[PDB]
A = this chain, B = another copy of it.
Amino acid sequence: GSKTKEGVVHGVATVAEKTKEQVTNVGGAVVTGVTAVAQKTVEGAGSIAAATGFV
């Protein structure tokens, strides 16, 4: 290709004003606050923000 983008994040502005933020976890899984993330996978399973409790 000549100009190609695959799995790209660009030109982003983010403001997050939070007075109080609190995360409590007991024996589980928590994913929080994922921002401006990019991935490319070939021949594989790709998961960005994947929470799983048990197996």
Contact = CB atoms under 8 A, between A and B. Distances in A.
Interface in A1-19: 1-19
Interface string A8-52: 111111111111111111111111111111111111111111111
A26 B29 CA distance: 9
A17 to B, nearest CB: 5
B11 A10 contact: yes
Contact of A34 (B4, B23, B45, B49): B49
B45 A46 contact: yes
Contacts of A44: 41, 43-46
A2 B5 contact: no
Contacts of A16: 14-18
